[PDB]
Amino acid sequence: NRFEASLDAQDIARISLFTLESGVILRDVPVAYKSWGRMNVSRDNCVIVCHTLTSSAHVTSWWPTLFGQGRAFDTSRYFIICLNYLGSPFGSAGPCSPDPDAERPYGAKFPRTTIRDDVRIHRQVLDRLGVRQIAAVVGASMGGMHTLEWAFFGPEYVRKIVPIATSCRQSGWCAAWFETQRQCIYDDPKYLDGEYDVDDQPVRGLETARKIANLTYKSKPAMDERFHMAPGVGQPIEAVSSYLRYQAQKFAASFDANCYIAMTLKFDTHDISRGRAGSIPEALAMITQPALIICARSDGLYSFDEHVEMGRSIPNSRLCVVDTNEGHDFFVMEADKVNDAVRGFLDQ
């Protein structure tokens, strides 16, 4: 697995049998994770960070300024842990990991997993590490979906949550965007129904998917600052072409197509209320922990309004609106502001 191989050192837990909520049984299941800091004697200073769609468990690589003495993820006070999602190419069971029923990797036959499946298996790993209580879950985008799900363990196990730039349930809007992206991959003749060779990926599908995704993560103001026309009578508009190509090419060179499909399909299963309550507001009201909901007005995927709805129905919640024009991106572009918010909340 070349994708996992490119990472810094990390731990693997192996779960010998795991029942997906579909009823499919996974065997000999690796769950990759990375932790920083030390558990206290009481084993109750654990902070779980939930990562983003295409990231690895190594949160330090895109959230580096959230880490360290006095920062949000204060390695002097907390045991910070991030566990890799099923479906990912970075160590946990997914299309890229060995299939024990044919050993060859799962490839295109890796079962469907849900947000709730990840939360369940990740908590099994924590039980093994001996974690007795969780000081906080913090996660953005896809990770704020897991964060909301962790909360349902109750306030005795999960003390606080910080869902960032996220939703309670899949929306038509995002479903359409991610389906569009998946279709770019399905239509690449190199895809071969997911049977492609690992070093002959559907590169053009993946790029195109990534370009789309990357723009949905931006805002109009942000792209307008970055590229504009000369006054009347890179930065110029000419430079857009290669901006788009550059980072999309890098991603396609270093991510797996089948994992992109598997991970995004996870989004479609998300609903904090299914099986639990008759509506989203009623499910939100079952979240009893203090919550800090962090959002930006010009996130184009996860709306301001839906974050306001979270804050309205979660009984002990505070809404934090980041002062920015950056779009869904903001939680990375404005890392210092997110850090201050998270740290202030963790100190109460």
Ligand X SMILES: CC(=O)OCC1=C(C(=O)O)N2C(=O)[C@@H](NC(=O)CCC[C@@H]([NH3+])C(=O)O)[C@H]2SC1
Q: How far is the CB of 311 from ligand X (least distance, A)?
A: 22
Q: Which does 276 bind (CB under 5 to 8 A by kind): a copy of itself, ligand X, none?
A: a copy of itself
Q: Which is nearer to a copy of itself, 134 or 263 (CB)?
A: 263
State the Cα–Cα distance between residues 15 and 243, nearest whole angstrom.
42
- Chain residues binding ligand X by CB under 6 A are 52-55, 62, 141-142, 214, 217, 247, 328-329, 332
Contacted by 53, from a copy of itself, ligand X, none: CB < 5 to 8 Å by type:
ligand X
- Which is closer to ligand X, CB of 25 or CB of 240? 240
> Between residues 57 and 142, which has the closer beta carbon with respect to ligand X?
142
User: Measured from the CB of residue 167, what is the shortest distance to a copy of itself in angstroms?
Assistant: 10
CB 91 within 8 A of CB 10: yes
DSSP state of 238: G
For 147-214, the DSSP string reads: HHHHGGG-TTTB--EEEES--SB--HHHHHHHHHHHHHHHTSTT-GGGT--TTS--HHHHHHHHHHHH
Least gap, CB of 239 to a copy of itself (angstroms) = 9
Question: Kind of pairing, strands 79-83 and 46-50?
Answer: parallel
Picking from 15, 70, 10, the residue whose alpha carbon sits closest to that of residue 36 is 10
Q: How far is the CB of 69 from ligand X (least distance, A)?
A: 24
141 is catalytic: yes
- The span from the CA of 171 to the CA of 169, in Å, is 6
Residue 187 binds which one of ligand X, a copy of itself, none, with CB within 5 to 8 A depending on kind? a copy of itself
328 is catalytic: yes
- Structure tokens that stand for 196 in this block: 């492609």
Catalytic annotation, pick one of 56, 141, 219, 313: 141
Least separation, in Å, of the C-beta of 141 and ligand X?
Answer: 4
What distances in angstroms separate CA 1 from CA 51, 98, 108, 121, one per listed residue?
A: 20, 9, 15, 22
Q: Which residues bind a copy of itself (CB under 8 A)?
A: 169-173, 175-177, 179-180, 183-184, 187, 204, 207-208, 211-212, 215, 218-220, 223-233, 237, 240-241, 243-245, 268, 271, 273-280, 282-283, 300, 303
- Decide: 205 and 188 in contact? Cβ < 8 Å: yes
Question: Residue 27 binds what, of a copy of itself, ligand X, none (CB under 5 to 8 Å, by partner type)?
Answer: none
Q: Which is nearer to ligand X, 308 or 332 (CB)?
A: 332
Q: How far apart are the first and last CA of the chain?
A: 43
Beta strands in 20-155 (DSSP E): 25-36, 46-50, 79-83, 134-140
- With CB under 5 to 8 Å by kind, the binding choice for 328 among ligand X, a copy of itself, none is ligand X
Question: What residues are annotated to the active site?
Answer: 141, 328
